[PDB]
DNA sequence: GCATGATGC
DNA sequence: AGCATCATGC
């Protein structure tokens, strides 16, 4: 039974509502500079659907699209927010967004388009987004009276659920982290995403065309040491060249045939010359393809700016993803991809990238939940942790710990905030399990308090059927009750982490929502390019470079209370390389 | 389409 | 070993 509407050919005051659900339909996944298709507007006057042209063309319109007293509920806003930014239009009063408050609910769901939000809710006169539109080559926007109707559809689904999902919300005590934090950092994302970061092209292009050296070298190298040539990226082919040909030990059987994971090859390194060329060759080869090939791929070529879109609605535990590019995983580690950094620049003439990062946000946020007296105790002395860990669980001095056992002391941090396993640190440490669980025990025997978090947050998650963070987030385990050990542990593993990733993500997501008011009161240029989620990277004029070095700690620093004190880093420089 | 293996925090 | 995205091979 088809659903009646308005196909306006004009606006008309009926549609400029005090609150409306509305619909900007951009089709295109990447959104920027990219086109509306159509509107759609559900109100107490009804349904309508208006042709973009006409729409974005009608002053009234357009004005009500920016009055912040219309109030909009929208699914993804933040995709309307930035079409709209790039035609010179801005977009407020978004009061509900169907997809946050999906996201918020049940992050398992999965909820990418209107009819998978309904149907959590039994709404189903709604079609999935790739029904109407296709996937792929057949992904098209469909002849107007297929596509007036879907998208007025989507607004009366919005319309009708907006509601249930807030009272829902208000249940969970996760309307302040719709309202008041999700929603609003919406807005700051679509800032960042439109402003976008600029790329020096040329540097680039140079580092390009060295790689390439290097990689024909090594790449010449491997071929002698092999007896003759192969594709090094061919997993088989490498396979029968070490394991066959070479002879190497198979100390490590993938499912039919052999593996040749970093860490086999780290392994193996010791018998044969070429392991080490084919690491190397692995390394400079993903710097090619993926930082230097696939970067100038998107970038802009008027403005030379990339412009990453930030998934706000997909990580289980509240973290950001970034896509095209993934502007969050940009090499640092080793110094030839570090340098792939120095293609990051300022936007502006006189302008410098400035870098604030959380130091053991991550390890702070477990003392402060755990109570650990003897964590909390180190935070406030602001000790190394990896001395402090190491100190405590091979019982020596600061003076005896030796680099190989804070390493050690290290990579039991890590598995703690993970959640701890035997075989994960054994894996890890390349050590026995039963050496790894000694390691662990001396660890729960000088963090009680931390053991007993473990322990309570895991029969919590038994008992309540979730987890949550300090601001509410929550993720549903299910798994946790499962009677196979494997899937049951990875669930009480996820029981011991998320609240712990999920906190940090849920205190840098208010400081950012924080260091933009303060930005605003004290109306300095400066502005947010990206968030790599324990660190938030500015450009600004040089000029305000000593404002940012007190202002932007101190916001990320009292975002939120903890019963240990939160540390801030911070560094400048004239490109994202030299921020350090 | 999925596995493998790289990159980040 | 927790959470992610991208390029490649088959
Ligand atoms: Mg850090």
Redesign the pocket.
């Known amino acids: 039974a088809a659903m009646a509407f308005t196909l306006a050919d004009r606006v008309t005051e009926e549609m400029l509502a005090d609150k409306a659900a509305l619909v900007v339909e951009v089709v295109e996944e990447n959104y920027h500079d990219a086109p509306i298709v159509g509107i759609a507007v559900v109100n107490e006057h009804g349904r309508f659907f208006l042709r973009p042209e006409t729409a974005l063309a009608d002053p009234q319109f357009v004005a009500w699209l920016g009055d912040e007293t219309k109030k909009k509920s929208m699914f993804d806003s933040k995709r309307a927010a930035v079409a709209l930014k790039w035609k010179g239009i801005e977009l407020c009063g978004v009061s509900f967004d169907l997809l946050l408050a999906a996201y918020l609910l049940d992050?398992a769901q999965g909820v990418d388009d209107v009819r998978a939000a309904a149907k959590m809710k039994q709404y189903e006169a709604v079609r999935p987004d790739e029904a109407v539109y296709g996937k792929g080559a057949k992904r098209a926007v469909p002849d107007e009276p297929v596509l007036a109707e879907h998208l007025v559809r989507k607004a009366a689904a919005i319309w009708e659920l907006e509601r249930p999902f807030l009272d829902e919300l208000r249940r969970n005590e996760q309307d302040r982290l719709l309202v008041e934090l999700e929603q609003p950092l919406s807005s700051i994302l679509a800032e960042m995403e439109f402003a976008g970061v600029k790329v020096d092209t040329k540097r680039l292009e140079q580092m390009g065309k060295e790689l390439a050296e290097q990689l024909g070298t090594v790449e010449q190298r491997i071929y002698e040491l092999a007896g003759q040539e192969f594709?090094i990226?061919?997993?088989?082919?490498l396979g029968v060249i070490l394991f066959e040909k070479l002879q190497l030990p198979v100390l490590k059987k993938?499912?039919t045939?052999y593996?040749?994971?970093?860490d086999?090859?780290e392994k193996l390194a010791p018998y044969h010359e070429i392991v080490e060329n084919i690491?190397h060759y692995?390394?400079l080869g993903?710097?090619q393809?993926?930082y230097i090939?696939?970067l100038l791929?998107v970038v802009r070529p008027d403005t030379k700016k990339v412009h990453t879109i930030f998934?706000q609605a997909?990580?289980?535990?509240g973290?950001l993803?970034?896509?095209?590019?993934?502007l969050?995983?940009?090499?640092?580690?080793?110094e030839e991809?570090?340098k792939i950094r120095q293609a990051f620049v300022p936007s502006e003439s006189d302008w410098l990238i400035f870098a604030a990062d959380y130091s053991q946000i991550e390890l702070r946020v477990l003392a402060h939940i755990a109570e650990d007296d003897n964590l909390m105790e180190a935070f406030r002395r602001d000790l190394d942790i990896h001395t402090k860990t190491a100190m405590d669980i091979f019982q020596v001095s600061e003076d005896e710990v030796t680099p190989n056992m804070r390493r050690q002391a290290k990579?039991?941090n890590?598995?703690i905030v993970?959640?701890?396993?035997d075989?994960?640190?054994a894996?890890?440490?390349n050590i026995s399990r039963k050496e790894a669980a000694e390691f662990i025990e001396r660890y729960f025997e000088s963090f009680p308090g931390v053991k007993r978090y473990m322990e309570n947050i895991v029969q919590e998650a038994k008992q309540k059927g979730y987890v949550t963070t300090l601001l509410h987030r929550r993720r549903y385990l299910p798994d946790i009750t499962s009677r196979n050990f494997n899937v049951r542990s990875?669930a009480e593993?996820?029981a011991m982490?998320?609240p712990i990733?999920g906190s940090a993500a849920d205190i840098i997501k208010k400081a950012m929502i924080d260091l933009n008011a303060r930005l605003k009161e004290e109306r300095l240029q400066a502005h947010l390019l990206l968030q790599?989620?324990?660190?938030l990277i500015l450009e600004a004029p040089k000029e305000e470079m000593e404002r940012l070095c007190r202002l932007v700690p101190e916001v990320m620093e009292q975002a939120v209370t903890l019963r240990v004190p939160l540390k801030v880093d911070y560094h400048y420089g004239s490109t994202w390389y030299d921020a350090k």
């Open positions: 992050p594709n990226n061919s997993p088989k082919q993938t499912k045939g593996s040749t994971s970093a086999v090859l690491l692995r390394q993903k710097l393809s993926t090939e696939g791929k998934n997909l990580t289980q535990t973290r993803s970034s896509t095209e590019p993934n969050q995983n940009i090499p640092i580690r080793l991809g570090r990579a039991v890590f598995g993970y959640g701890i396993s075989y994960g640190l894996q890890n440490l990875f593993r996820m982490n998320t990733q790599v989620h324990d660190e």
